[PDB]
């Protein structure tokens, strides 16, 4: 990944769902891009093959809880169980340990932050594809807001979202963006910031 060229992080919450997730994985593979999938533990348990596929194809996997409660409605113990049960199923299937967590609905507090011991990964651009389940509406909202360094949220459980994601992936690729994982974007930002180190010997 070249930090001097455009980067963007496409991210997908709520899968795996083979019919839609596999289509998105196909699009990413066709256009030579990667993404980050924030998965539900319950769905990993239903669809272990899709977890393996997304990892095999170079995508990053994050934790999106077991069954999608608002974690701030739970006790800390119950919320940690949602997260840890999801770590556990991912580990049991794949041997992979996610480092990124995306709390359902963005809901988090300082106590959960400190106790989860994971990197909280939210987003910058949200076309609300759960609300406007319409391919062109989703595409246009994303493409109008896309820019270097941004993180896009799509929910990979709807047909219109998978169809929109294919078009978004194509258009961003045509525009010269590198489609990177969340962790790769973090690294790019650090590489760009590190240019300031050169001031020490200028
Ligand atoms: Zn979700």
UniProtKB/Swiss-Prot annotation:
Chain positions of site Raises pKa of active site His: 129
Induction: Negatively regulated by the two-component system YycFG.
Disruption phenotype: Cells lacking this gene show sensitivity to lysosyme, in contrast to wild-type.
Highest rank taxon of the organism: Bacteria
Residues that hold a divalent metal cation according to the record: 14, 64, 68
Domain NodB homology positions: 6-180
Active site: 13 (proton acceptor), 155 (proton donor)
Compartment annotation: Cell membrane
Miscellaneous remark of the record: The product of deacetylated GlcNAc4 by PdaC is GlcNAc-GlcNAc-GlcN-GlcNAc. Derepression of pdaC in cells depleted for yycFG leads to increased resistance of the cell walls to lysozyme digestion.
Chain's role: Catalyzes the deacetylation of N-acetylmuramic acid (MurNAc) residues in peptidoglycan, a modification that confers resistance to lysosyme. Is not able to deacetylate N-acetylglucosamine (GlcNAc) residues in peptidoglycan, but can deacylate chitin oligomers such as GlcNAc4 and GlcNAc5. Is essentially not active toward chitosan (partially deacetylated GlcNAc polymer) and has very low activity toward chitin (GlcNAc polymer). Does not deacetylate GlcNAc.
Family: In the N-terminal section; belongs to the RsiV family. In the C-terminal section; belongs to the polysaccharide deacetylase family.
Protein's name in the database: Peptidoglycan-N-acetylmuramic acid deacetylase PdaC
Organism (species): Bacillus subtilis (strain 168)
Residues represented out of the complete protein: 273 to 467 of 467
């Amino acid at each position: 990944v070249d930090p001097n060229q455009k980067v963007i992080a496409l991210t997908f919450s709520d899968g795996p769902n083979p019919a839609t997730t596999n289509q998105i994985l196909d699009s990413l593979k066709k256009y030579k891009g990667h993404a980050t999938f924030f998965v539900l533990g319950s769905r990993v348990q239903y669809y272990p093959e899709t977890l393996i596929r997304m990892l095999k194809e170079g995508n990053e996997v994050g934790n999106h809880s077991w069954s999608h409660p608002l974690l701030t409605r739970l006790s800390v113990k119950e919320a940690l169980k949602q997260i840890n049960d999801t770590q556990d199923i991912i580990e049991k299937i794949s041997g992979y340990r996610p480092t990124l967590v995306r709390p359902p609905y963005g809901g988090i507090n300082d106590e959960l932050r400190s106790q989860m011991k994971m990197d909280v990964a939210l987003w910058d651009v949200d076309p609300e594809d759960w609300k406007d389940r319409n391919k062109k509406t989703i595409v246009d909202r994303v493409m109008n807001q896309a820019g270097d360094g941004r993180t896009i949220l799509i929910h990979d459980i709807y047909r219109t979202s998978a169809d929109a994601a294919d078009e978004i992936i194509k258009k961003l690729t045509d525009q010269g963006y590198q489609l990177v994982t969340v962790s790769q974007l973090e690294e790019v930002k650090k590489q760009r910031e590190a240019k300031e180190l050169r001031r020490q010997w200028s």
